[PDB]
Coordinates of C-alpha atoms and ligand atoms in Angstrom, one line a residue:
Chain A
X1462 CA 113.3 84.0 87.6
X1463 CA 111.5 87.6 87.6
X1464 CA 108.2 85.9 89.0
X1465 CA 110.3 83.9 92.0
X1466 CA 112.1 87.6 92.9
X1467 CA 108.5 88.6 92.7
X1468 CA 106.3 86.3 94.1
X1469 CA 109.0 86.2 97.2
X1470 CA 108.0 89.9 98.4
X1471 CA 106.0 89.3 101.9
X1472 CA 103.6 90.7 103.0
X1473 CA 105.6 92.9 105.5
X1474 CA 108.2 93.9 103.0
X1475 CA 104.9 94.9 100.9
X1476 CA 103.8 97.1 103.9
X1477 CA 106.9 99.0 104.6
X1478 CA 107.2 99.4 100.6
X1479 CA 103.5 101.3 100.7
X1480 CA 104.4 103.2 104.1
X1481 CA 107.4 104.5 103.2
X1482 CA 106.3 105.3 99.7
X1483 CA 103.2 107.3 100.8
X1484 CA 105.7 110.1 101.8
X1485 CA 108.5 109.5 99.4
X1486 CA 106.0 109.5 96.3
X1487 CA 104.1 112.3 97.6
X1488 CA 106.6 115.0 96.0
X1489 CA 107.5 112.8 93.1
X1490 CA 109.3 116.5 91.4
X1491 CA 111.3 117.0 94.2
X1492 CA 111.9 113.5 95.4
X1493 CA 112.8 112.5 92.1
X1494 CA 115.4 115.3 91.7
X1495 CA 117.1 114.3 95.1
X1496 CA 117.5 110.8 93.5
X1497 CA 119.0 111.8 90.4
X1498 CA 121.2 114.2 91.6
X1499 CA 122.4 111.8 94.5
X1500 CA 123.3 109.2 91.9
X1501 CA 125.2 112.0 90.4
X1502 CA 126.9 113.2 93.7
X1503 CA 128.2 109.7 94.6
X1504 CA 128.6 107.5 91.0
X1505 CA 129.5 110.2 89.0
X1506 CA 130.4 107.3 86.5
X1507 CA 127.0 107.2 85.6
X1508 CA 126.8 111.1 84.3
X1509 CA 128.1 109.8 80.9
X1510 CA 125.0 107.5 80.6
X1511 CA 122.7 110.9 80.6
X1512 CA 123.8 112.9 78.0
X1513 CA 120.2 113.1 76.6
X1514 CA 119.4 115.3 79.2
X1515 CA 122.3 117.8 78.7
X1516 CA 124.0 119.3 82.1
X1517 CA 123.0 117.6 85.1
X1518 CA 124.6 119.6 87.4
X1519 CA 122.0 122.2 87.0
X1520 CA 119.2 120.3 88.9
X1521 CA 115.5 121.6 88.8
X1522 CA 116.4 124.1 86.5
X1523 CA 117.2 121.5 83.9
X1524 CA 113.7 121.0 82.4
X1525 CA 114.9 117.9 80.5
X1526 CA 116.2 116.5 84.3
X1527 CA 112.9 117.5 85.6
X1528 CA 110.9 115.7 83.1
X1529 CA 113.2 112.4 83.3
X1530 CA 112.8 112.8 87.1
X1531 CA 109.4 112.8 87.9
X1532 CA 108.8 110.0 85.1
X1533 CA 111.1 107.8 87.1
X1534 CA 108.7 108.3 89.7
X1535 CA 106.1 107.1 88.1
X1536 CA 107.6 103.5 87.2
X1537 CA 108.2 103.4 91.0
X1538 CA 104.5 104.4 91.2
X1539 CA 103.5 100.8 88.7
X1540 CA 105.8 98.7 90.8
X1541 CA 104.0 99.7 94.0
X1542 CA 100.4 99.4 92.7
X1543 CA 101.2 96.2 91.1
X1544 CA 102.7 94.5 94.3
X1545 CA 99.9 92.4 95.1
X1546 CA 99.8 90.7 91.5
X1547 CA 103.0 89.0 90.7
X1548 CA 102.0 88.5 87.1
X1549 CA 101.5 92.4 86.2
X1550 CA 104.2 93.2 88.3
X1551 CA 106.4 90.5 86.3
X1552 CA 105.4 92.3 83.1
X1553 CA 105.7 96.1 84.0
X1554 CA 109.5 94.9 85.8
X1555 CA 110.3 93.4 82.2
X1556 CA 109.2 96.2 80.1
X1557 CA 111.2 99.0 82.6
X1558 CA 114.3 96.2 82.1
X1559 CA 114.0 96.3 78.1
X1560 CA 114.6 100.2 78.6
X1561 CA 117.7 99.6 80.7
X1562 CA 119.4 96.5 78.4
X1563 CA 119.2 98.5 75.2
X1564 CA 120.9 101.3 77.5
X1565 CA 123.8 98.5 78.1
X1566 CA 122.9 98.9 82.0
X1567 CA 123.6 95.6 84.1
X1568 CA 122.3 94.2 87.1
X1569 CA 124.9 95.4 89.1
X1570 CA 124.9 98.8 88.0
X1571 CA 121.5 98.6 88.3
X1572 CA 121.8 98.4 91.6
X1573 CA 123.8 101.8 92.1
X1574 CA 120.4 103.1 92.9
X1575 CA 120.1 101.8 96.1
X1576 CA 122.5 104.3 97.8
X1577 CA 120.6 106.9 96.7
X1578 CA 117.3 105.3 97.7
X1579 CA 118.6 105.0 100.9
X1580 CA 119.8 108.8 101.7
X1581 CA 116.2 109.5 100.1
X1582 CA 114.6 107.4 102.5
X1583 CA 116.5 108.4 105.7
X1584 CA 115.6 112.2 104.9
X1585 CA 112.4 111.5 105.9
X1586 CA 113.8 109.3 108.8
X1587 CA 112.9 106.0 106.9
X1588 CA 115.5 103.8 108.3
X1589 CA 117.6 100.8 107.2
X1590 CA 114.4 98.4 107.8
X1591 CA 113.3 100.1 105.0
X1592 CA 115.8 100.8 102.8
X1593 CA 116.0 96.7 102.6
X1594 CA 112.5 96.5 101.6
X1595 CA 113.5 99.0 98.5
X1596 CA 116.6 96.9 97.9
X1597 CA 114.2 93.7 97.6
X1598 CA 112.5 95.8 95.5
X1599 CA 114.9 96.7 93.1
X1600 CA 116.2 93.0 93.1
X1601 CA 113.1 92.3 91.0
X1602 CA 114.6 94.4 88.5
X1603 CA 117.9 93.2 88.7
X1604 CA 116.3 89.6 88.1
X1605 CA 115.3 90.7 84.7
X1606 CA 118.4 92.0 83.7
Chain B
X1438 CA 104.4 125.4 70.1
X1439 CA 104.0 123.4 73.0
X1440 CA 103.5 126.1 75.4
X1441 CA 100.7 128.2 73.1
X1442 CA 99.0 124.1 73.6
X1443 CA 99.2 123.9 76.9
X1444 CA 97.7 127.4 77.2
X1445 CA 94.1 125.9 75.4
X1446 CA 94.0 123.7 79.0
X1447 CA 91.2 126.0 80.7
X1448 CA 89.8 124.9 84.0
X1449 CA 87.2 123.9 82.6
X1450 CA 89.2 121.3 80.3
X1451 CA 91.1 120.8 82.9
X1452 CA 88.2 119.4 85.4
X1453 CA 86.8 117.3 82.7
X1454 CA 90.2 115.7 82.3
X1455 CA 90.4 115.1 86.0
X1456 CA 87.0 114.0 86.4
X1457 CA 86.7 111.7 83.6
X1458 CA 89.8 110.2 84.7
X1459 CA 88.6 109.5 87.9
X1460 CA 86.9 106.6 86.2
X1461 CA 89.0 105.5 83.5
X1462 CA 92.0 105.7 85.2
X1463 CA 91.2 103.3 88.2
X1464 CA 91.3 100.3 85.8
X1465 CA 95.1 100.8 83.9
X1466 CA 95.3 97.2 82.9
X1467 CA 91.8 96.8 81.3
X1468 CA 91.1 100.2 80.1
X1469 CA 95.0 100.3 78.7
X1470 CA 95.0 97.0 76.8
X1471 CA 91.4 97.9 75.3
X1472 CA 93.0 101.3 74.4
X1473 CA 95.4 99.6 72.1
X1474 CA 93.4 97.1 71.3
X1475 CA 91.2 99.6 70.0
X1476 CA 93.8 101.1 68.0
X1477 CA 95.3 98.2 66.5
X1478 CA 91.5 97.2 65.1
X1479 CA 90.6 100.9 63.7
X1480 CA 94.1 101.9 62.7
X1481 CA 95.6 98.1 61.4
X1482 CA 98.3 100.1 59.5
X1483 CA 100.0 101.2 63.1
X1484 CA 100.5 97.6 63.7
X1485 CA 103.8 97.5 62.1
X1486 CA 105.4 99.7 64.5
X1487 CA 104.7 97.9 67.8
X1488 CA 106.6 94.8 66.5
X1489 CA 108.5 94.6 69.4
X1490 CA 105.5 93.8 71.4
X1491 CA 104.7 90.2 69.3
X1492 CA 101.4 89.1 69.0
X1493 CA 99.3 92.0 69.5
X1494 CA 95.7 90.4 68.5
X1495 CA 96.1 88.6 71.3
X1496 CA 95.6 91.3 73.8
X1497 CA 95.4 90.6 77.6
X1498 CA 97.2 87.7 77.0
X1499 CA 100.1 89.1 75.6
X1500 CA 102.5 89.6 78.4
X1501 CA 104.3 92.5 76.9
X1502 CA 101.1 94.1 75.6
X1503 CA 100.2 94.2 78.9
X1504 CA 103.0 95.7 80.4
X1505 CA 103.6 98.5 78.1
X1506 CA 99.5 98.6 78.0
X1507 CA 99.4 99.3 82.4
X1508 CA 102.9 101.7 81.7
X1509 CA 100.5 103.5 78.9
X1510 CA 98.4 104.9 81.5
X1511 CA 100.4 105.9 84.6
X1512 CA 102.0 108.1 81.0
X1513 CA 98.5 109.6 80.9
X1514 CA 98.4 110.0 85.5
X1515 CA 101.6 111.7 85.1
X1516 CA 100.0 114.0 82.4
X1517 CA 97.3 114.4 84.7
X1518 CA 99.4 115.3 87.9
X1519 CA 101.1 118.0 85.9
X1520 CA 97.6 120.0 84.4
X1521 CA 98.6 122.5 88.1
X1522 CA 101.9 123.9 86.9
X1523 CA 102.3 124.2 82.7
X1524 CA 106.0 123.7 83.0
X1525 CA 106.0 120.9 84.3
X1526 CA 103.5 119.3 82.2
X1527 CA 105.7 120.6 79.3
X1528 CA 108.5 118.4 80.2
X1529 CA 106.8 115.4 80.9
X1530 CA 105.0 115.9 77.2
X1531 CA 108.7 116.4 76.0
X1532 CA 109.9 113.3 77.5
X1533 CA 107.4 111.0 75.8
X1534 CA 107.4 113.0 72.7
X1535 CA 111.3 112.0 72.7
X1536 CA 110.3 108.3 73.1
X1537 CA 107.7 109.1 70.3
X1538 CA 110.3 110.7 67.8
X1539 CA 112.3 107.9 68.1
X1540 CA 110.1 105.8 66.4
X1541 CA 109.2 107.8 63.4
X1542 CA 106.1 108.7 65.0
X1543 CA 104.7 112.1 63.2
X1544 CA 101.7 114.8 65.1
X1545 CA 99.3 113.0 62.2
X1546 CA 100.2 109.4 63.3
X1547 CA 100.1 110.2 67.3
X1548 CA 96.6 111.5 66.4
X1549 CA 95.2 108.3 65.8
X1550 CA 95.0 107.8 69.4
X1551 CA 91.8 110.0 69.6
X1552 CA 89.4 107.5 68.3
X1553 CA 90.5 104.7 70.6
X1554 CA 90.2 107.3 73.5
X1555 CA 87.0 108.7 72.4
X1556 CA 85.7 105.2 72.1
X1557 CA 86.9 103.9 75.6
X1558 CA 85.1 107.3 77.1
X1559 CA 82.0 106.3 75.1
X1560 CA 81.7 102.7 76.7
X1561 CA 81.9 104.5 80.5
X1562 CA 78.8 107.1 79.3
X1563 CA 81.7 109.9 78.7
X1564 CA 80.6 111.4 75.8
X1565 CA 81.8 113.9 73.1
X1566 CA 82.4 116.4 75.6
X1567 CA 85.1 114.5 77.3
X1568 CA 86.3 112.9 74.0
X1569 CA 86.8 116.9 73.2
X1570 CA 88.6 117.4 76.5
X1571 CA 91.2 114.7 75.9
X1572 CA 91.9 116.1 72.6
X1573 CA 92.9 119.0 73.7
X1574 CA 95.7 117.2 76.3
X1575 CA 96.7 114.9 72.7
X1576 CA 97.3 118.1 71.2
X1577 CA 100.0 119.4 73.9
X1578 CA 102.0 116.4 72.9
X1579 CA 101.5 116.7 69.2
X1580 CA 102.6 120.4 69.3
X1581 CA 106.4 118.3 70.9
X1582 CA 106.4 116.2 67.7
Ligands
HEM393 C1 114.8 102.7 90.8 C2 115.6 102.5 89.7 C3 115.3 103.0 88.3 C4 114.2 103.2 87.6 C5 112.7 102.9 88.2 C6 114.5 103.7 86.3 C7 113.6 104.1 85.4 C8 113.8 104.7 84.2 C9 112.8 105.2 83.3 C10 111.3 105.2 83.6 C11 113.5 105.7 82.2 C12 113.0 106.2 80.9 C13 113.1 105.1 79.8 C14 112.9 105.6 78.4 O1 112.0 106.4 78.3 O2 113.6 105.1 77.5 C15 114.9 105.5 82.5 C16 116.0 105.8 81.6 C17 117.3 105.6 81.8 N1 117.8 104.9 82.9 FE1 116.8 104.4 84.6 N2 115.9 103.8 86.2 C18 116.4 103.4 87.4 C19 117.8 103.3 87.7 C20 118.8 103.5 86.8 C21 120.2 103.3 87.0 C22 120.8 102.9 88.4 C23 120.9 103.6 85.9 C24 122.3 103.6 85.5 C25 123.3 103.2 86.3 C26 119.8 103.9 84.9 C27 120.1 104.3 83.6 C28 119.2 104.9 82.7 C29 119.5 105.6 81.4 C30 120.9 105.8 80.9 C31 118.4 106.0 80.9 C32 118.1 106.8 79.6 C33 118.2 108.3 79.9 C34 117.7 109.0 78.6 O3 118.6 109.1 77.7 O4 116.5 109.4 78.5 N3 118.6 103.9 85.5 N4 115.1 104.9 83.7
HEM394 C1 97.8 109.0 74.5 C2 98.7 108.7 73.6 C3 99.9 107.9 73.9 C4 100.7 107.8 75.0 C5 100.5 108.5 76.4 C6 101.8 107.0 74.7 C7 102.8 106.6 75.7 C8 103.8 105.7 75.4 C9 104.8 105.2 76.3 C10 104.7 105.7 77.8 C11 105.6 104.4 75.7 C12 106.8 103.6 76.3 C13 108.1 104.4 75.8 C14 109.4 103.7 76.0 O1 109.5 102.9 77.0 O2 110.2 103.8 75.0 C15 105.2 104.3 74.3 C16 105.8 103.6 73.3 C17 105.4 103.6 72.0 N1 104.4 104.3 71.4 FE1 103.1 105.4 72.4 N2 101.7 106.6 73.4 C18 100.6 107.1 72.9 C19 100.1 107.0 71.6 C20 100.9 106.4 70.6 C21 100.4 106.2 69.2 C22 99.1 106.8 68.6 C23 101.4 105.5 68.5 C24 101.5 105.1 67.1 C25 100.7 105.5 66.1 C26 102.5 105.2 69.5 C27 103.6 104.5 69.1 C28 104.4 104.0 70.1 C29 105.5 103.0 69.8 C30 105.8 102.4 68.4 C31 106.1 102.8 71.0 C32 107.2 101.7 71.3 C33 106.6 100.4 71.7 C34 107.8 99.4 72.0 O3 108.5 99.0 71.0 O4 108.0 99.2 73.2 N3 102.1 105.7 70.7 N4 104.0 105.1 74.2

């Protein structure tokens, strides 16, 4: 279940979610641009799933990117302020899922992001210790979908 | 327009946004389910449109009330973020005007939210003033609508 993914994060997992995101989530604009567009760069199967927000390929300067961007952010922002409740994080994970199944995205392409997360990460010389912790992360996700 | 809205956000609005948030937005999951709740007493005939959610009289204990109730008001931090730099505030209020449109929902309807928000201000000793100040923010995303 969602709860078992949940309720399995540790407590050092936790910290080296909250460390790492105190930089990354600190220029959530910017940060979230880099992610978007780095899904682009390397699964550019996935451009077809964004035509709501026109050309891609423009970055920043596409306002509707920008807005989708930073928003993104801000679901990573509920997910790391509820880590230390199970049940609300269970129940934010769910409703972020809803918005992916009626988008036809599985599990595994769900998991796509993680590239992405992890070049995002190691710009700021986060390393593989913690781009596991982000994949445990998104596993919560993928347990809801 | 949009942009002619976000123009009426004077510094003055602006620090009453930010300081009455201050308050109201250190408790998302209790002062986001009584938002709704709030609205789905005064304004019964909104009801219909959250039918995805279930059971809404049930409040807290509604799991998806709850989730979409906590994902309610990191909407409102990202709002908040943005009052620095009108462009981006303009596509955030874009973006959830989209998931707004999408359900039929008109300026009018979107509106209604003013009572439940002056009413949650009013049970923190935030008074009309602030109520004021939070309509003006409403309004940006009415003007997208
Ligand atoms: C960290 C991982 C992710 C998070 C937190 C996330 C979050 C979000 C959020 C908050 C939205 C807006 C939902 C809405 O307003 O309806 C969204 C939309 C969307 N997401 Fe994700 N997402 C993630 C990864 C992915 C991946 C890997 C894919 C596809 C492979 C995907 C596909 C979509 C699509 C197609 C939309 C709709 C775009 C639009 O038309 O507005 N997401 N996502
Ligand atoms: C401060 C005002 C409001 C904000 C910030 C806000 C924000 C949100 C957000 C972030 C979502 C989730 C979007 C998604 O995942 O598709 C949502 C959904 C929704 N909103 Fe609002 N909303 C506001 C007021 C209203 C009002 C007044 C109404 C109706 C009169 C309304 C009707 C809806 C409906 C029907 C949904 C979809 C619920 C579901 O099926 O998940 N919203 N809103």
């Amino acid at each position: 279940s969602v709860y078992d993914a949940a309720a399995q994060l540790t407590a050092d997992v936790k910290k080296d979610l909250r460390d790492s995101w105190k930089v990354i989530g600190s220029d959530k604009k910017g940060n979230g641009v880099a992610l978007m567009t780095t899904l682009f760069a390397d699964n550019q199967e996935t451009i077809g799933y964004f035509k709501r927000l026109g050309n891609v390929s423009q970055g920043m300067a596409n306002d509707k990117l920008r807005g989708h961007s930073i928003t993104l952010m801000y679901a990573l922002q509920n997910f790391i302020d509820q880590l230390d409740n199970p049940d609300d994080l269970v129940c934010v994970v769910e409703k972020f899922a809803v918005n992916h199944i009626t988008r036809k995205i599985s599990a595994a392409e769900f998991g796509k992001i993680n590239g992405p997360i992890k070049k995002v990460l190691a710009s700021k010389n986060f390393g593989d210790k913690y781009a596991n912790a982000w994949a445990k992360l998104v596993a919560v996700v993928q347990a809801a979908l």
